[PDB]
Design an enzyme around this catalytic site. Structure first.
Site, PDB file in Angstrom:
ATOM      1  N   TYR A  84     -16.871  -3.558 -52.228  1.00 24.53           N
ATOM      2  CA  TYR A  84     -17.063  -4.858 -51.603  1.00 24.53           C
ATOM      3  C   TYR A  84     -17.452  -5.897 -52.627  1.00 24.53           C
ATOM      4  O   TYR A  84     -18.580  -6.340 -52.649  1.00 24.53           O
ATOM      5  CB  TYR A  84     -18.088  -4.743 -50.474  1.00 24.53           C
ATOM      6  CG  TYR A  84     -18.268  -6.020 -49.662  1.00 24.53           C
ATOM      7  CD1 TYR A  84     -17.220  -6.549 -48.924  1.00 24.53           C
ATOM      8  CD2 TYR A  84     -19.498  -6.664 -49.599  1.00 24.53           C
ATOM      9  CE1 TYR A  84     -17.345  -7.671 -48.210  1.00 24.53           C
ATOM     10  CE2 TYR A  84     -19.622  -7.835 -48.830  1.00 24.53           C
ATOM     11  CZ  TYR A  84     -18.578  -8.330 -48.123  1.00 24.53           C
ATOM     12  OH  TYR A  84     -18.723  -9.509 -47.412  1.00 24.53           O
ATOM     13  N   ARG A  89     -15.044 -13.691 -52.147  1.00 27.32           N
ATOM     14  CA  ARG A  89     -15.355 -12.763 -51.060  1.00 27.32           C
ATOM     15  C   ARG A  89     -15.707 -13.518 -49.798  1.00 27.32           C
ATOM     16  O   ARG A  89     -16.236 -14.620 -49.864  1.00 27.32           O
ATOM     17  CB  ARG A  89     -16.497 -11.872 -51.500  1.00 27.32           C
ATOM     18  CG  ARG A  89     -16.677 -10.608 -50.670  1.00 27.32           C
ATOM     19  CD  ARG A  89     -17.723  -9.711 -51.253  1.00 27.32           C
ATOM     20  NE  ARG A  89     -19.054 -10.306 -51.072  1.00 27.32           N
ATOM     21  CZ  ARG A  89     -20.169  -9.814 -51.618  1.00 27.32           C
ATOM     22  NH1 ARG A  89     -20.152  -8.730 -52.363  1.00 27.32           N
ATOM     23  NH2 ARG A  89     -21.329 -10.433 -51.406  1.00 27.32           N
ATOM     24  N   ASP A  90     -15.487 -12.892 -48.656  1.00 30.88           N
ATOM     25  CA  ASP A  90     -15.953 -13.399 -47.352  1.00 30.88           C
ATOM     26  C   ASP A  90     -15.427 -14.811 -47.141  1.00 30.88           C
ATOM     27  O   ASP A  90     -16.152 -15.738 -46.802  1.00 30.88           O
ATOM     28  CB  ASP A  90     -17.476 -13.300 -47.253  1.00 30.88           C
ATOM     29  CG  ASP A  90     -17.997 -13.421 -45.865  1.00 30.88           C
ATOM     30  OD1 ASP A  90     -17.395 -12.921 -44.898  1.00 30.88           O
ATOM     31  OD2 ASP A  90     -19.091 -13.981 -45.676  1.00 30.88           O
ATOM     32  N   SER A  96     -21.817 -14.125 -46.870  1.00 26.19           N
ATOM     33  CA  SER A  96     -21.698 -13.049 -47.841  1.00 26.19           C
ATOM     34  C   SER A  96     -20.818 -13.430 -49.021  1.00 26.19           C
ATOM     35  O   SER A  96     -20.226 -12.578 -49.663  1.00 26.19           O
ATOM     36  CB  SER A  96     -21.239 -11.741 -47.194  1.00 26.19           C
ATOM     37  OG  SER A  96     -22.265 -11.189 -46.429  1.00 26.19           O
ATOM     38  N   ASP A 136     -13.368  -6.939 -44.198  1.00 30.55           N
ATOM     39  CA  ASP A 136     -12.946  -8.283 -43.754  1.00 30.55           C
ATOM     40  C   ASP A 136     -11.745  -8.891 -44.460  1.00 30.55           C
ATOM     41  O   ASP A 136     -11.138  -9.819 -43.947  1.00 30.55           O
ATOM     42  CB  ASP A 136     -14.063  -9.314 -43.808  1.00 30.55           C
ATOM     43  CG  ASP A 136     -15.320  -8.901 -43.011  1.00 30.55           C
ATOM     44  OD1 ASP A 136     -15.165  -8.240 -41.962  1.00 30.55           O
ATOM     45  OD2 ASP A 136     -16.451  -9.218 -43.423  1.00 30.55           O
ATOM     46  N   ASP A 315     -27.193  -9.683 -42.055  1.00 30.30           N
ATOM     47  CA  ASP A 315     -25.829 -10.196 -42.071  1.00 30.30           C
ATOM     48  C   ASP A 315     -25.741 -11.612 -42.681  1.00 30.30           C
ATOM     49  O   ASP A 315     -24.650 -12.104 -42.920  1.00 30.30           O
ATOM     50  CB  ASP A 315     -25.237 -10.299 -40.687  1.00 30.30           C
ATOM     51  CG  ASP A 315     -25.200  -8.993 -39.971  1.00 30.30           C
ATOM     52  OD1 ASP A 315     -24.791  -7.989 -40.585  1.00 30.30           O
ATOM     53  OD2 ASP A 315     -25.503  -8.933 -38.779  1.00 30.30           O
TER      54      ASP A 315
HETATM   55  O1  LIG Z   1     -19.399  -6.761 -43.417  1.00 25.80           O
HETATM   56  C1  LIG Z   1     -19.373  -7.274 -44.708  1.00 25.80           C
HETATM   57  C2  LIG Z   1     -20.486  -8.313 -44.891  1.00 25.80           C
HETATM   58  C3  LIG Z   1     -20.068  -9.628 -44.249  1.00 25.80           C
HETATM   59  N1  LIG Z   1     -20.472  -9.900 -42.872  1.00 25.80           N
HETATM   60  C4  LIG Z   1     -21.305  -8.848 -42.233  1.00 25.80           C
HETATM   61  C5  LIG Z   1     -22.410  -8.489 -43.183  1.00 25.80           C
HETATM   62  O2  LIG Z   1     -23.288  -7.535 -42.616  1.00 25.80           O
HETATM   63  C6  LIG Z   1     -21.877  -7.852 -44.442  1.00 25.80           C
HETATM   64  O3  LIG Z   1     -22.830  -8.214 -45.448  1.00 25.80           O
HETATM   65  C7  LIG Z   1     -22.924  -7.320 -46.498  1.00 25.80           C
HETATM   66  O4  LIG Z   1     -23.600  -6.172 -46.039  1.00 25.80           O
HETATM   67  C8  LIG Z   1     -23.665  -5.153 -47.044  1.00 25.80           C
HETATM   68  C9  LIG Z   1     -24.297  -3.956 -46.362  1.00 25.80           C
HETATM   69  O5  LIG Z   1     -25.542  -4.304 -45.810  1.00 25.80           O
HETATM   70  C10 LIG Z   1     -24.450  -5.651 -48.266  1.00 25.80           C
HETATM   71  O6  LIG Z   1     -24.331  -4.746 -49.335  1.00 25.80           O
HETATM   72  C11 LIG Z   1     -23.968  -7.001 -48.728  1.00 25.80           C
HETATM   73  O7  LIG Z   1     -24.871  -7.578 -49.659  1.00 25.80           O
HETATM   74  C12 LIG Z   1     -23.777  -7.969 -47.594  1.00 25.80           C
HETATM   75  O8  LIG Z   1     -23.133  -9.154 -48.056  1.00 25.80           O
HETATM   76  O1  LIG Z   2     -12.684 -15.771 -38.304  1.00 22.24           O
HETATM   77  C1  LIG Z   2     -13.332 -14.478 -38.443  1.00 22.24           C
HETATM   78  C2  LIG Z   2     -13.829 -14.000 -37.085  1.00 22.24           C
HETATM   79  C3  LIG Z   2     -12.752 -13.847 -35.987  1.00 22.24           C
HETATM   80  N1  LIG Z   2     -13.392 -13.414 -34.750  1.00 22.24           N
HETATM   81  C4  LIG Z   2     -14.072 -12.139 -34.907  1.00 22.24           C
HETATM   82  C5  LIG Z   2     -15.207 -12.282 -35.905  1.00 22.24           C
HETATM   83  O2  LIG Z   2     -15.823 -11.022 -35.958  1.00 22.24           O
HETATM   84  C6  LIG Z   2     -14.685 -12.742 -37.253  1.00 22.24           C
HETATM   85  O3  LIG Z   2     -15.775 -13.046 -38.120  1.00 22.24           O
HETATM   86  C7  LIG Z   2     -16.054 -12.075 -39.186  1.00 22.24           C
HETATM   87  O4  LIG Z   2     -16.749 -11.030 -38.530  1.00 22.24           O
HETATM   88  C8  LIG Z   2     -17.001  -9.981 -39.452  1.00 22.24           C
HETATM   89  C9  LIG Z   2     -17.664  -8.873 -38.691  1.00 22.24           C
HETATM   90  O5  LIG Z   2     -16.822  -8.332 -37.661  1.00 22.24           O
HETATM   91  C10 LIG Z   2     -17.911 -10.516 -40.544  1.00 22.24           C
HETATM   92  O6  LIG Z   2     -18.239  -9.507 -41.497  1.00 22.24           O
HETATM   93  C11 LIG Z   2     -17.316 -11.745 -41.259  1.00 22.24           C
HETATM   94  O7  LIG Z   2     -18.247 -12.268 -42.199  1.00 22.24           O
HETATM   95  C12 LIG Z   2     -16.926 -12.787 -40.202  1.00 22.24           C
HETATM   96  O8  LIG Z   2     -16.189 -13.823 -40.853  1.00 22.24           O
END
Ligand SMILES: OC[C@H]1CNC[C@@H](O)[C@@H]1O[C@@H]1O[C@H](CO)[C@@H](O)[C@H](O)[C@H]1O
Ligand SMILES: OC[C@H]1CNC[C@@H](O)[C@@H]1O[C@@H]1O[C@H](CO)[C@@H](O)[C@H](O)[C@H]1O
Ligand SMILES: *[C@@H]1O[C@H](CO)[C@@H](O)[C@H](O)[C@H]1NC(C)=O
Ligand SMILES: [Ca+2]
Ligand SMILES: [Ca+2]
Length: 360
Positions: A84, A89-90, A96, A136, A315
């Protein structure tokens, strides 16, 4: 061919140390302290979310598993690791955002990170290693091409994904590409486009042996299987992960990708959740620890139920002034105040523990 068969799953020391050093000293109730200690033993994925984790946490966890297995662990332990660290990213949310940017050497930095991971995994060919690749990323490529950062990152994400899949295609490794969740790619309109995108990446990577399939529900809260659709899922007929996977697998299989699945259930124990809308992903209230990691899934297409996102790790920050503030993390159904994504969020941990099903 299930890589979760014939092993047990190692519970890593990073999460165990979070619970014992950050959580437990804040809990006074004797039964709750004991329950928290039990959660620390549940084997969740370890995330390589920062480059520095590669030579430190990855090597240490693989070393500890090697040691336990050499000492006679039966069944032998396997590692569970998330890759990841894509640049940019993200791409659809601030929370994130990672350490690397495409505009500042990110492609080179990431290829080096993958190469170093490869070197390490080759040196630990005695440790069965299960990987989730880049939560993601590909789901954003399906649905978020209206977001400039996602549109601008797509070609890089594709190139780097294929790079990772080929480089980490090692005999002792199993890979699952992240594939969103029922409320994201499972909407009936998104699901064929998603099948096409994933099957083409698989094909363009040369159908690597180690690619076992897809991960779903990572860092989300969906049910595996509930008889009644939670209200926030309406009007999506694929209202749980079982519906999504049963709809998705035939489509992938027709396009040459007979994907097996793993399903995150680490924050799925309480259903319906406290999400007011299904798109509310950040630190959702009304959630609990869910079914324990297992290969005993009762479903042909599901290799394992897993804990991918480690519950208690945040999160996203609720500080509206922070660089990584996403509005999702300030909603009324997001638990607040919340620290930076990935940092320990003790009140959240306690919520998950209180609502755990099965209980601790
Ligand atoms: O799911 C991937 C990311 C983005 N959105 C949901 C969030 O919970 C997640 O964050 C990452 O979570 C991992 C596991 O806890 C961490 O290692 C990362 O630092 C964090 O960005
Ligand atoms: O545009 C991204 C959305 C679309 N709808 C579902 C929603 O879950 C999604 O957001 C992402 O959600 C994931 C977790 O399921 C996160 O880790 C992402 O950061 C977030 O963008
Ligand atoms: C990433 O970590 C490796 C060691 O694993 C190091 O050699 C490299 O310099 C780091 N990458 C960056 C861009 O700092
Ligand atoms: Ca089975
Ligand atoms: Ca129960």
């Amino acid at each position: 061919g299930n890589p979760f068969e014939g092993v047990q799953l190692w519970a890593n020391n990073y999460y165990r140390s979070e619970v014992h050093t950050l959580a437990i000293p804040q809990i006074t109730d004797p039964a709750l302290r004991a329950a928290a200690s039990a959660v620390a033993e549940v084997p969740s994925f370890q995330w390589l979310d920062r480059n520095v984790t590669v030579d430190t946490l990855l090597v240490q966890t693989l070393s500890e598993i090697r040691e336990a297995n050499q000492a006679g662990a039966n069944p032998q332990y396997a590692a569970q690791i998330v890759v990841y660290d894509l640049p940019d990213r993200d791409c659809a949310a601030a929370a994130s955002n990672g350490e690397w940017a495409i505009a500042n050497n990110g492609v080179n930095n990431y290829k080096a990170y993958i190469n170093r991971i490869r070197e390490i995994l080759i040196s630990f060919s005695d440790v069965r290693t299960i990987l989730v690749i880049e939560p993601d990323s590909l789901a954003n490529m399906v649905t978020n091409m209206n977001v400039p950062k996602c549109s601008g990152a797509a070609s890089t994400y594709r190139e780097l994904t294929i790079y990772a899949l080929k480089q980490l295609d090692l005999p002792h490794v199993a890979m699952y590409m992240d594939a969103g969740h029922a409320g994201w790619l499972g909407w009936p309109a998104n699901i064929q486009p998603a099948a096409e995108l994933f099957a083409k990446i698989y094909e363009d990577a040369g159908k690597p042996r180690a690619v076992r399939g897809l991960a779903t529900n990572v860092a989300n809260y969906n049910a595996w299987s509930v008889s009644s659709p939670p209200p926030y899922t309406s009007p999506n007929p694929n209202y749980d992960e079982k519906h999504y996977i049963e709809a998705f697998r035939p489509l992938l299989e027709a396009r040459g990708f007979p994907a097996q699945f793993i399903v995150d259930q680490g924050r799925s124990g309480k259903q319906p959740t406290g999400q007011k809308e299904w798109g509310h992903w950040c630190n959702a209230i009304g959630t609990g620890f869910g079914m324990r990691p297992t290969a005993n899934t009762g479903h042909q297409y599901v290799d394992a139920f897993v804990w991918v996102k480690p519950g208690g790790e945040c999160d996203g920050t609720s500080d509206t002034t922070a660089a990584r503030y996403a509005y999702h993390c300030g909603l009324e159904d997001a638990l607040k105040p919340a620290p930076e994504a990935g940092q320990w969020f003790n009140e959240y941990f306690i919520q998950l523990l209180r609502n755990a099903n099965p209980p601790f």
